[PDB]
């Protein structure tokens, strides 16, 4: 069966907490949609840094991601190991640099440049198990669809959103990583700084660049997915102030994600370009989640490239099938 639950452990709607993986006590927030027609596809939206899961399923500003369950969706919020099973912390432990391996540590989304996250060069990582784990367990108590299970998040949700596409790509029919980082290194695998990083992308666009977000190196295959990269345009930057300042920019790194997927045959890549800066989509946020959410369900996992249709998305962006084409000149 592909349903199951961790000994000890029945989901139910709202907050889940003590969810057992790899020996971590996890939550997570389950929000059912009104009626599951035999199979309920599932949207599995992440937080980034500062906001908390709560603010991202309900309120406006960070997404209003429960508006999904309203149009047949199960929404599942899963709650960062930093936030010790609290919903509503925003940013606390949450906000720092990562540890034990990891680079940044609101999610076990890219191994960390040195020697300490070379064991992340092919383990997925704590988080990357317990998303799947959370969703196979939410389908013991909901009739979920297997063929249409997407993931997504903003900011380092995003980061998380690419590292499980990459390394779990067997599971997930796909997902929505907006504004992530694709932590681009040499092709060897080593990192040097952000400035540097910035430079190299820019002066080769188009080439498919490895990254410590995924496995070193990058898979020349995955299984079959749909997958929505959404950048916020010339403000979409992190910049945390001094004295790191600057530290992320995700103009080449949502360049490098689409060139990536655009490379992969049974993977459909879709580039949104939007104009809101790093945060959640703030144009016409419930049109633009709905229109995301039901491009991916048009594709369940299995589908043909060639049969994949993009429709018009809400006014505030401009997506095409593919790389971007809008980044670089």
């Known amino acids: 069966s592909e349903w199951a639950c961790p000994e000890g452990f029945t989901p139910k709607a709202g907050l889940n907490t003590d969810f057992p993986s790899d020996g971590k006590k996890r939550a997570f927030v389950v929000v059912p949609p009104k009626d599951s027609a035999g199979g309920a596809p599932v949207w599995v939206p ?7 899961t709560n603010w991202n399923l309900n309120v406006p500003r960070s997404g209003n991601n429960a508006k999904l369950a309203e149009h047949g969706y199960m929404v599942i919020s899963p709650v960062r190991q930093c936030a ?4 509503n912390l925003g940013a606390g432990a949450c906000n720092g640099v990562g540890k034990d391996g990891w680079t940044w540590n609101p999610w076990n989304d890219g191994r960390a440049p040195d020697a300490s996250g070379d064991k992340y060069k092919t383990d997925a990582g704590d988080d990357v198990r317990f998303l799947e784990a959370m969703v196979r367990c939410v389908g013991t108590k909901w009739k979920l669809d297997r063929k249409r299970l997407f993931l997504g998040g903003i900011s380092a949700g995003g980061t998380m959103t690419n590292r499980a596409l990459l390394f779990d790509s067997e599971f997930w029919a796909g997902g929505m990583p907006i504004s992530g980082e694709w932590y681009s290194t040499k092709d060897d695998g080593s990192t040097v700084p952000f400035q540097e990083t910035r430079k190299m992308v820019a002066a080769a666009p188009a080439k498919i660049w490895q990254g410590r977000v995924g496995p070193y190196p990058l898979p020349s295959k995955l299984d079959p997915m ?3 990269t959404v950048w916020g345009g010339e403000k979409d930057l992190w910049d945390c102030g001094p004295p790191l300042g600057l530290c992320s920019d995700y103009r080449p790194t949502t360049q490098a994600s689409s060139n990536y997927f655009s490379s992969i ?9 939007a104009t809101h800066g790093h945060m959640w989509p703030q144009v016409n946020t419930d049109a633009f989640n709905l229109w995301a959410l039901n491009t991916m369900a048009s594709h369940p996992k299995g589908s043909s490239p060639k049969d994949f249709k993009l429709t018009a998305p809400p006014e505030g962006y401009s997506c095409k099938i593919g790389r971007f084409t809008d980044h670089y000149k």
Do not use: L, Y
Request: glycine content about 4%.
């Open 46 to 52: 992440m937080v980034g840094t500062v906001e908390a």
């Open 84 to 87: 010790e099973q609290d919903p």
């Open 226 to 228: 749909v997958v929505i």
């Open 265 to 273: 045959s049974n993977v459909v890549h879709v580039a949104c370009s």
